[PDB]
Structure formats: C-alpha cells, structure tokens
Amino acid sequence: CEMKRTTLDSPLGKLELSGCEQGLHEIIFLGGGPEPLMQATAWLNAYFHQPEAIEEFPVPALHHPVFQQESFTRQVLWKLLKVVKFGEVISYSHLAALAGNPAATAAVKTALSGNPVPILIPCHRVVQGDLDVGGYEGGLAVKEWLLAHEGHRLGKR
Numbered sequence: 001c002e003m004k005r006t007t008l009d010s011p012l013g014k015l016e017l018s019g020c021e022q023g024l025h026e027i028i029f030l031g032g033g034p035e036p037l038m039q040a041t042a043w044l045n046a047y048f049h050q051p052e053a054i055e056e057f058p059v060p061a062l063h064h065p066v067f068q069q070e071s072f073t074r075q076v077l078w079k080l081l082k083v084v085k086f087g088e089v090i091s092y093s094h095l096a097a098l099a100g101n102p103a104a105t106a107a108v109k110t111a112l113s114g115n116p117v118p119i120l121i122p123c124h125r126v127v128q129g130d131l132d133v134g135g136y137e138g139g140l141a142v143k144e145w146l147l148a149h150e151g152h153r154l155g156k157r
C-alpha cells in the first residue's frame with residue numbers, strides 16, 4: 001500500500017495513525033475530509049474531546065492485512081467494532097460466541113492482542129467478567145482510564 005501518516009495529541013499521549021487510500025491501517029501509541037486517515041483522526045479527536053457526538057462520526061475504512069481476508073480474528077475485530085458501544089463492556093467468552101466460536105476465549109484474547117487499531121476497535125471494552133476487567137495489551141491503567149472516560153463501573157481514572 002501507498003501509506004500516509006499523521007499524529008494526534010490525546011490525553012493518552014501522541015497517537016500515530018497510518019493508512020492508505022483504501023483504509024486506515026494502524027493506530028499506534030507513541031507515549032479533515034473524505035480519506036480514511038482524515039476520518040480516523042476526526043473520529044479519535046471526537047472520542048476524546050466530543051464523546052457525546054461519537055456515533056455521528058464516520059468510522060474509517062480499515063485496510064490492515066488482518067481485515068483483507070476472512071478469519072476468526074477478523075470476525076472478532078469486526079464484531080467488536082459493530083456491537084460493543086461507548087460505555088459498554090463484553091466478556092472475552094461472549095465475544096468468542098459473537099464471532100462464531102463459543103468455546104474460544106483464549107483464541108479471542110490472542111486475536112485482540114493483534115488489533116491494529118485500538119480504541120476505534122475497542123479491545124479495551126472486552127473484559128474477563130463482571131468483576132474482573134482483565135488485562136490489556138496497552139497496559140491495565142490505560143484500559144481502566146478509557147473505561148472511566150466512558151463512565152463504566154469497571155473504569156478507574
């Protein structure tokens with residue numbers, strides 16, 4: 001792909017976004033019109049700074065290779081994106097079922113670890129169970145901060 005990059009300041013530090021004309025590829029934690037990259041930047045900016053309007057912002061097309069071919073991993077990521085909204089959580093186990101393989105909690109955890117576009121695809125909203133927020137590829141404190149930003153019981157600022 002012919003790649004383009006942009007950065008966005010956020011409460012979680014600088015975010016590097018990468019994408020081509022067919023879609024956003026990655027959102028990386030470094031520590032506005034029609035192209036997918038501009039839609040992604042606008043979406044993430046709204047997520048942090050205008051969260052009440054987040055459903056109004058177009059979700060960018062996604063073009064990381066994990067989205068280019070059918071797989072259970074792609075199903076996990078797509079179903080998570082489609083279904084689990086701002087201020088909600090879902091268990092690894094129920095997400096496994098949603099993605100078409102009810103037994104497959106460990107496989108869901110591995111799929112989520114491969115998510116190239118965190119927050120937009122909300123791996124932070126997938127928890128172990130009602131009273132166990134579980135782990136996070138980006139660090140437990142970040143997961144808990146995002147859930148607090150979204151007003152969830154399991155969040156901690």
Ligand SMILES: [Zn+2]
Pocket residue numbers: 001002019020021022023025063064
């Ligand atoms: Zn691409």
